[PDB]
């Protein structure tokens, strides 16, 4: 089954207003990696730029103390608010949906691969309102995930940029 297909995308999703910088606040997921290495999370930043009906997305975060930039392309699936991170070899495709968001303070995104749903909360800046945090946890519960499957990411140590030697391009096939 596809849990993400039951998720309603942000009505009349406007990529123009969604563009810019987003700070990753938390992830709700049953992923084994997070359960075992979640307490090792790095401050993560997302930078979005509309590319037609698709969205170019760069993710910034440190690896071994060094700032990296990952370049991806959220492809247009034909449905407003729904995007596709195409599969690459044995790497399965990742479906994405921008659900709740006011474009100006927070965004709730869902990601799905192999039928497993993951939920992410982003914020334009910190601190995040109690209302948004509680709202996000409510969505995590509705996604059949427990409180022990919620991981809050660092609030400091973010990367503003990366040099040419630390840019991972996952756009060019």
């Amino acid at each position: 089954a596809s849990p993400i297909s039951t998720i309603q995308p942000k009505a009349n999703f406007d990529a123009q207003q969604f563009a810019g910088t987003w700070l990753l606040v938390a992830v709700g997921s049953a992923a084994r990696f997070l359960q075992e290495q979640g307490h090792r999370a790095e401050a993560t930043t997302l930078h979005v730029a509309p590319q037609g009906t698709a969205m170019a997305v760069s993710t910034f975060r440190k690896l071994d103390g060094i700032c990296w930039q990952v370049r991806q392309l959220y492809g247009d699936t034909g449905v407003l608010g729904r995007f596709l991170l195409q599969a690459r070899g044995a790497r399965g495709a990742v479906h994405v949906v921008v659900a709740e968001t006011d474009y100006q303070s927070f965004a709730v995104l869902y990601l799905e691969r192999a039928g497993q749903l993951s939920v992410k909360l982003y914020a334009r800046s910190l601190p995040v309102s109690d209302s948004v945090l509680s709202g996000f946890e409510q969505r995590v519960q509705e996604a059949h995930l427990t409180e022990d499957q919620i991981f809050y990411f660092p609030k400091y140590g973010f990367c503003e940029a990366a040099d040419q030697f630390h840019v991972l391009d996952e756009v060019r096939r």
Binding site: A31, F33, L34, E42, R61, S118, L168, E170
Partner: peptide
Amino acid sequence: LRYDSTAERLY
């Protein structure tokens, strides 16, 4: 190097 966005994993 690869990035799994579902688990915020860089490996």
